[PDB]
Design a protein around this nucleic acid. Structure first.
Ligand SMILES: [Mn+2]
Length: 664
RNA sequence: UUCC
């Protein structure tokens, strides 16, 4: 099935991905890098006291608060769903090697027995109906850009003025670029408007990953994470190998003189892709309007904010099934990309824009440094984009693509195994749309709340209910995949967007409640994904702008966890043993300092006004903007706070751009 | 050195 072409950095095709400026050239050549992260100001993730603290705390919490998850994966009791050993990693030091991204996932999908297209006409109509409902009556809005984010290929600029210019120029020339692409002139579109080229692969830390303690040996065991070497990646797995990366941290002593306590490992690394900003801008200009529509009109299934917001919906259900999707981005099907583009064309979307969109989901990928002495290789030929990597994380609409795929996948699963009586309602496009429109508003006996690969499927009283229980049972048995599209299972310890669904003795949705995940509090406070970047003067540009603020939203976010008090007390006690200081006081000081620093960034904030006007969401986002990438959306954040993190392109320019893209 |  054809190996993907690959080119070394020295090749003109790779050289053309990096502009003649220092940042771009440095990004092209960056070698493998690792080191302790500055967990908080003046504290390294490998500080001996900190590791001693994590050692004591993880053992104590695991011992005293064993997971409470029943045979159907519902959590109850203490609200704990697994041991607390995930904190045992040397943050900043990755597993070796990281994976080479798969150039084609067609074989991966076929081998997993997943379909290479909609299986029935019903399904084809539902996927297309999703497109019609999602992309139809959009309202223009300013294109918002994350401060400090890189434009990646080819400029690698982090300057907001430059990013605004690139974005406006891109909206002005998107049409011309898309038409060149329609003509097969990809190099021309790339050379003239920087729309094309490749995604830039950056490996990110998943700071906590499963670790177990072998009762027999008393030794800890880290979860094996399988990685593909270059041969496997360019042949879609036909050749080369898939093997377990090494999370062994012993090497750190040998290599860096760092003491490694027993049971501490290197971090799981995941591939992330930064998109060529000039190509992403015209896509983002449409994506935001789409999010605004689905979060308003279809808020029921798509707009998720608080634990109570989720709770009110699930309470009305007779059955709630917490699903899990295996490796969603890598399994994402290219045929859905093509189905979507086709339907947008049928709807009247500008062909040149659809071509830009199609091309962003077929782009080559430049691999930086998966390990020492490896990398700096372009996979795929930019002159004719034809990769099938699945869903690229830096594509301007990745959340929407995952949501569209999965929402319909779950609905089909409900139709197939529980509601055949609803099939007659889906006869053509008009009826598919009316049915989906009703289903997405929570008006049918089968329902769902979802976001990309996380979801909870519900059944109210009715004919589908009995089928709902059979499906749940099938998932429990876990021998047969309920979907022809993705690998679906039930989540062990059902949760939705960070909140655990805590059931009581009845094990029914009506008497269940959503509570924060105490383990995530621990992940966030003691295993951040990034250091504090104390040398980046502009805090709004940091991955963690105001870490101290999270202390002020902690109670609101995690207060409902059954063992909240116990954990804060165990932390205080262990921190005392390790540092001879009070953790609470340490955090109160950090809270105070960051609160004062925040006023410097918020114009509508007195030169020392407190956090009075800010919401718990505002605070969590200021401490971790990444939660805006997977948990919340712009509309969930106070306006004066959103401005701290983002800057926008004029509404006049995006308005004129959208007008040329949309049908009506 | 990415994407609500
Ligand atoms: Mn879940």
């Amino acid at each position: 099935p054809r190996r993907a072409p690959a080119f070394p950095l020295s090749d003109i095709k790779a050289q053309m991905l990096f502009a003649n400026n220092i940042k771009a050239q440095q990004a092209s050549k960056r070698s493998f890098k690792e080191g302790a992260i500055e967990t908080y100001e003046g504290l390294l993730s490998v500080d001996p006291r900190f590791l001693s603290f994590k050692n004591e705390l993880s053992r104590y919490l695991t011992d005293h608060f064993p997971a409470n998850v029943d045979e159907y994966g519902r959590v109850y009791g203490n609200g704990v769903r697994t041991n607390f050993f995930g904190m045992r990693h040397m943050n900043g030091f990755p597993m070796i090697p990281a994976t080479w991204p798969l150039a084609s996932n067609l074989k991966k999908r076929a081998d997993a027995d997943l379909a290479d297209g909609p299986v029935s006409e019903r399904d084809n109509l539902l996927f297309r109906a999703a497109v019609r409902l999602m992309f139809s009556d959009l309202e223009p809005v300013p294109l918002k850009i994350r401060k400090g984010s890189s434009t990646c290929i080819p400029y690698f600029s982090n300057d907001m003025g430059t990013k605004i210019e690139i974005a406006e120029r891109a909206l002005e020339k998107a049409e011309e670029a898309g038409n060149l692409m329609l003509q097969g002139k990809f190099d021309d579109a790339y050379q003239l408007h920087q729309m094309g080229g490749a995604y830039y692969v950056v490996y990110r830390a998943q700071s906590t990953d499963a670790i177990t303690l072998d009762p027999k040996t008393g030794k800890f065991v880290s979860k094996d994470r399988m990685v593909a070497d270059f041969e496997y990646a360019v042949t879609g797995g036909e050749q080369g190998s898939l093997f377990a990366a090494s999370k062994d941290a012993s090497r750190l002593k040998e290599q860096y003189g760092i003491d490694v306590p027993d049971g501490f490992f290197c971090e799981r690394r995941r591939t992330a892709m930064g998109g060529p900003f000039a190509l992403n801008a015209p896509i983002m200009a449409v994506a935001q309007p789409v999010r605004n529509k689905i979060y308003s009109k279809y808020a029921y299934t798509f707009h998720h904010t608080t634990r109570l917001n989720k709770e009110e919906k699930v309470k009305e259900w007779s059955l709630c099934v917490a699903t899990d999707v295996s490796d969603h981005d890598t399994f994402w099907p290219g045929w859905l990309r093509d189905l979507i583009c086709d339907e947008l064309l049928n709807m009247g979307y500008a062909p040149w824009w659809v071509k830009l969109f199609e091309t962003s989901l077929k782009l080559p990928v430049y691999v930086g440094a998966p390990a020492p002495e490896q990398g700096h290789t372009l996979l795929g030929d930019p002159s004719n984009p034809d990769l099938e990597v699945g869903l690229s994380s830096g594509q301007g609409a990745t959340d929407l693509m995952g949501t569209l795929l999965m929402s319909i996948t779950y609905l089909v699963m409900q139709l197939d195994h529980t509601a055949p009586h609803l099939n007659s309602r889906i006869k053509d496009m008009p009826s598919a749309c009316r049915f989906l429109d009703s289903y997405w508003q929570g008006h049918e006996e089968i329902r769902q709340i979802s976001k990309s690969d996380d979801a909870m499927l519900g059944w109210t009283k009715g004919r589908a209910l009995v089928g709902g229980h059979r499906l749940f049972e099938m998932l429990k048995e876990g021998k047969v995949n309920p979907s022809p599209y993705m690998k679906i299972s039930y989540e062990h310890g059902g949760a939705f967007l960070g909140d655990i669904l805590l059931y009581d003795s009845r094990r029914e949705p009506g008497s269940a409640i959503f509570v924060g995940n105490i383990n995530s509090m621990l992940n966030n406070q003691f295993s951040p994904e990034y250091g504090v970047q104390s040398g980046v003067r502009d805090r709004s540009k940091r991955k963690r702008p105001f870490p101290g603020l999270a202390w002020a939203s902690m109670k609101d976010t995690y207060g409902a966890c059954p063992i909240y008090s116990d954990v804060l007390e165990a932390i205080e006690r262990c921190w005392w043993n390790a540092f001879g200081e009070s953790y609470r006081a340490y955090r109160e000081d950090m809270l105070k300092r960051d609160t004062l620093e925040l006023s410097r960034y918020v114009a509508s904030m007195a030169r020392q006004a407190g956090l009075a006007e800010l919401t718990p969401i505002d605070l969590e986002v200021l401490a971790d903007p990444n939660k805006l990438q997977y948990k919340w959306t712009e509309a969930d954040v106070s306006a004066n706070i959103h401005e701290v993190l983002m800057h926008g392109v004029s509404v006049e320019k995006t308005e004129r751009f959208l007008r040329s893209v949309m049908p009506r």
